[PDB]
């Protein structure tokens, strides 16, 4: 949504652009735009979705 | 200076004109061809037009 994706070498994070602040990537932090195949340089991952653990109750 | 991939720089520039950056990544090859072509028009424009 705002900021940019990065990896420390083994995990993937989003940070704001002007100050390193690693947030674990979620459906809150990100917006979808279709399937992968159009995007040059995309990478595989897990995006966390906070609703799915809550409705596990 | 901080290095950044140029397709990742233009995704910042598109946000700075209120266009969501997926409009760049879904069109990157097309945008690149338009920029490359437009610089080609500048070569011809300057080469002819004193
Ligand atoms: C994320 C991305 O663009 N990766 C490319 C990679 O696929 C290519 O093999 C290399 C050499 O051109 O340059 C970089
Ligand atoms: C850039 C990259 O890692 N792409 C892989 C792709 O080759 C694979 O088919 C897919 C299966 O989920 O996972 C992702
Ligand atoms: C000169 C010109 O604009 N040609 C367009 C091309 O750029 C576009 O990629 C294609 C899509 O089908 O349609 C045609
Ligand atoms: C990457 O970050 C995660 C969470 O801070 C940590 O568990 C992991 O050890 C880090 N790995 C490296 C290579 O820094």
Quick gist of this model?
Chain A has 57 residues and is mostly beta strands. Chain A contains one helix and three strands; from the N terminus they run βββα.
- β content of chain A, as a range? 15-25%
Bound heterogens, unique: 2-acetamido-2-deoxy-beta-D-glucopyranose
State the end-to-end CA separation of chain A.
29 Å
Class by alpha and beta content of chain A: mainly beta
Largest interface (CB < 8 Å)? A-B, 9 and 10 residues
List the secondary-structure elements of chain A in sequence, H or E.
EEEH
Q: How are strands sequenced across the largest beta sheet of chain A? A: 1-2-3
Q: Oligomerization state of this entry?
A: part of a larger assembly
Number of H/I helices of chain A? 1
Silhouette of chain A: globular
Classify the helix fraction of chain A into a percent range: under 10%
Rounded to the nearest angstrom, the radius of gyration of chain A is 13 Å
**How many DSSP E strands of chain A?**
3
Main sheet specs of chain A:
3 strands, antiparallel
PDB class: viral protein
Keywords: SARS-CoV-2 Spike Protein Trimer, viral protein
Entry title: SARS-CoV-2 RBD up Spike Protein Trimer without the P986-P987 stabilizing mutations (S-GSAS)
Chains A, B: Spike glycoprotein
């Amino acid at each position: 949504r705002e900021g940019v994706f990065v990896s420390n070498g083994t995990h993937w994070f989003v940070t704001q652009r002007n100050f390193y602040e690693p947030q674990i990537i979620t459906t809150d932090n990100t917006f979808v735009s279709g399937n992968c195949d159009v995007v040059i340089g995309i990478v595989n991952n897990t995006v966390y979705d906070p609703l799915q653990p809550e409705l596990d109750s | 200076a901080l290095q950044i991939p140029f397709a990742m720089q233009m995704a910042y520039r598109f946000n700075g004109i209120g266009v969501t950056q997926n409009v760049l990544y879904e069109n990157q090859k097309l945008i690149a061809n338009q920029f490359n072509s437009a610089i080609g028009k500048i070569q011809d424009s300057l080469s002819s037009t004193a």
